[PDB]
Amino acid sequence: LPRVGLGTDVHPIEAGRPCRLLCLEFDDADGCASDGDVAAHALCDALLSAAGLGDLGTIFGTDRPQWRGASGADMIRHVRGLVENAGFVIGNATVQVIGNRPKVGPRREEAQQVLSELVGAPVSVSATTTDGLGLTGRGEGLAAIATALVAAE
Amino acid sequence: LPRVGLGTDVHPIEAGRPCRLLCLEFDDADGCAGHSDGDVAAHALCDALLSAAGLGDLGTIFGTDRPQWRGASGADMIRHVRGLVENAGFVIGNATVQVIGNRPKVGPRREEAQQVLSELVGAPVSVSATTTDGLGLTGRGEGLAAIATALVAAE
Amino acid sequence: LPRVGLGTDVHPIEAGRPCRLLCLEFDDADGCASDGDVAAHALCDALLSAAGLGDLGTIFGTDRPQWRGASGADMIRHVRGLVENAGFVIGNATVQVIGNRPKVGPRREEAQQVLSELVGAPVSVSATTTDGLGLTGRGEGLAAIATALVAAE
Ligand SMILES: Nc1ccn([C@@H]2O[C@H](COP(=O)(O)OP(=O)(O)O)[C@@H](O)[C@H]2O)c(=O)n1
Ligand SMILES: Nc1ccn([C@@H]2O[C@H](COP(=O)(O)OP(=O)(O)O)[C@@H](O)[C@H]2O)c(=O)n1
Ligand SMILES: Nc1ccn([C@@H]2O[C@H](COP(=O)(O)OP(=O)(O)O)[C@@H](O)[C@H]2O)c(=O)n1
Ligand SMILES: C=C(C)CCOP(=O)(O)OP(=O)(O)O
Ligand SMILES: [Zn+2]
Ligand SMILES: [Zn+2]
Ligand SMILES: [Zn+2]
Known part of the structure; x- marks a missing residue:
């Protein structure tokens, strides 16, 4: 049988930090x-x-010198290698961004292309607001939830 | 290899709005805000x-506040998405949705919800519900959330 | 085709209460x-x-006498049985804990062993914080989100 996985992540928006999201950099927003x-x-x-x-903590730890400066793209490439060396083929993955800004839509196809090449399988990208509700609706943070499907050789 | 997908949505409760939820009409309840x-x-x-x-x-397919989709039922949206999915060469295997909120109670109409949604999706749809125990973005009867998964396969 | 499912849950944290989480005891945190x-x-x-x-409401009802005070392990044992009786084989399941405390990392492999034995299939365990944001970040509650993959016969 194929195997399913899920991950979520939430971070505070840091005013004035470059907006790095979906392995893109977005103008007119904060990361x-x-x-x-x-x-x-x-x-x-x-x-x-x-x-x-x-x-993430299992594999990257915190402040390890070998991961200094590494981007989301660097982390995905490394995670891809670990999954493949554990004997798995990656079928697909999906990710939904939850928050107000940036608007993901105008660059959604570009994100899908960047992320599918990093993962080596089709990655679906989507986005939603929470219509003013919760930490994301208040513009305090950004959230994402992701799925993946792999299968053992 | 089959493919998995995930969707979430959140709306505030709008007072007086008919409660359209899980493609059913729940009397004795509001009523989420939206186009x-x-x-x-x-x-x-x-x-x-x-x-x-x-x-x-949704924005890809239905756009923003498009006249053609005003007051559009969830049924309209699901039937449209089912056709896009099948035209693209996929067979839908199953889908699931969990409603997160206090009111209405899904339990009494859960089996009916699965019946309606399975007909519209064309595959077995699981329905579940949870409250938040008085906590968070929807812990007040402020709003309703749903989280859904789907599994499809070529060809 | 195999079938996918998803489950979430949120509970308030209570001072003094024993922390039963992931079918382990963290004699350690609340609780x-x-x-x-x-x-x-x-x-x-x-x-x-x-x-x-x-x-859970479908299956354990509300304040049903026979499930009053059923542990997490009791519940999954029964759920596993219901799933196999409906003619399904469980492929895998995953669960992510969302909250500040306890730290799951030091006992993550133990939780995976315990839960894999109870489900009869590989259970992945992970954890995240929300970096101070929302009900879990303020320490008012603990959440979890889980997926499962099953197949007929
Ligand atoms: N950060 C965001 C939020 C929404 N959107 C898009 O805007 C459309 C409307 O989002 P929404 O705020 O109604 O999200 P929901 O709460 O309806 O799921 C979405 O379907 C996406 O296409 C986006 O591109 N980037
Ligand atoms: N809007 C809702 C929320 C929960 N429920 C029911 O409540 C049951 C348990 O959710 P809950 O949050 O009320 O109770 P626990 O999650 O604390 O066990 C669910 O399995 C549903 O059967 C419902 O029918 N409609
Ligand atoms: N209650 C918790 C929360 C996180 N953790 C661990 O803490 C690490 C850091 O989580 P994080 O705060 O960066 O959460 P994310 O929002 O980045 O996913 C996780 O990768 C887990 O290894 C834990 O062991 N127990
Ligand atoms: C959509 C996500 C990620 C949850 C946000 O809700 P909150 O946990 O922030 O709810 P509040 O108590 O802050 O209103
Ligand atoms: Zn993170
Ligand atoms: Zn919506
Ligand atoms: Zn619970």
Whole structure:
């Protein structure tokens, strides 16, 4: 049987930080307190759970010198290698961004292309607001939830 | 290899609005805000199917406040998304949705909800519900949330 | 085709209450207000939804005498049985804990062992914080979210 995984991530928006999201950089928005890319983090966690390999802390720890400066793209590439070396093929992954700004839509196809090449399987990208409700609706943070489907050789 | 997708949606409760939820009409309840009928479970399901199939999200398909989709039922939206999914070459295997909120109570109409949604999706749809125990974005009867998954396969 | 399901759950944290989480005891932190095992509940809901069998309310009712005070392990044991009886084989399941305390990392592999034995299939365990934001970030509550994959026969 194929195996399913899921990951979520939430970070505060940091005013004046460059907006790194979905392995893109967005003009006219602020990023999150790596580069704070909530979508990349959720995707790593979905892939790692699908394959039984733990989560971000398990594999990256905190302030390890070998991960200094590394982006969401660097993390995804590394997670992809771990999943493949554990004997899995990646079927697909999806990620939904939850928050107000930036608007993901105008660059949604570009994100899908960037992320599908990082993962080596089709990655679906979507977005929603919460219509003013909760930490995301208040513009306090950005959230993402991701799924992945892998299968053992 | 089959493909999995996920969708979530959140709306505030709007006083006096008819409660359209899970493609059912719940009397004795409001009533989510939106350009649509505010069916949070239908929107989440549409998102889950569109994402499993790599076809975008609601904004991709229905746009913003388009005259053609005003007051559009969740049923309209699901039937439209089912056709897009099948035209793109996929068979829908199953889908699931969990409603997160205090009112209405889904339990009494859960089996009916699954019946309606399975007909519209063309595959078995699981329905569940949870409250928040008085906590968070929807812990007050402030709003309703839904989270949905879907599984599709070529060809 | 195999079938996917998802489950979420949120409980308030209560001072003094024993922390039963992921079918372990963290004799350590608070402490949710059955035994408040948010992760066991989410997992049950994911399995039931994949199999098309309802949710916790469907199956344990409300204040049913025979399930009054059923632990998380009791619940998953029964859910596993319902799923197999409906003619399904469980492929895998995953659960992410969302909250500040306890720290799941040091006992993550133990939780995976315990839960995999109870489900009869590989259970992935992970954890995240919300970096100070929302009900879990303020320490008012603990949440979990879980997926499951099952197949007929
Ligand atoms: N950060 C965001 C939020 C929404 N959107 C888009 O805007 C449309 C409307 O979003 P919404 O705020 O109604 O989200 P929901 O609460 O209806 O699910 C979505 O379907 C997406 O296409 C986006 O591109 N980026
Ligand atoms: N809007 C809602 C919310 C919950 N429920 C029911 O409440 C049951 C348990 O959710 P809850 O939050 O009320 O109770 P626990 O999650 O604390 O066990 C669910 O399995 C549903 O059967 C419902 O029917 N309609
Ligand atoms: N209650 C918790 C929360 C997080 N953790 C661990 O803390 C690490 C850091 O989580 P985080 O605060 O960066 O959460 P994210 O929003 O980045 O996903 C996680 O990868 C887990 O290994 C834990 O062990 N127990
Ligand atoms: C959509 C997500 C990620 C949850 C936000 O809700 P909150 O947990 O912030 O709810 P509040 O108590 O802050 O209103
Ligand atoms: Zn993160
Ligand atoms: Zn909506
Ligand atoms: Zn519970």
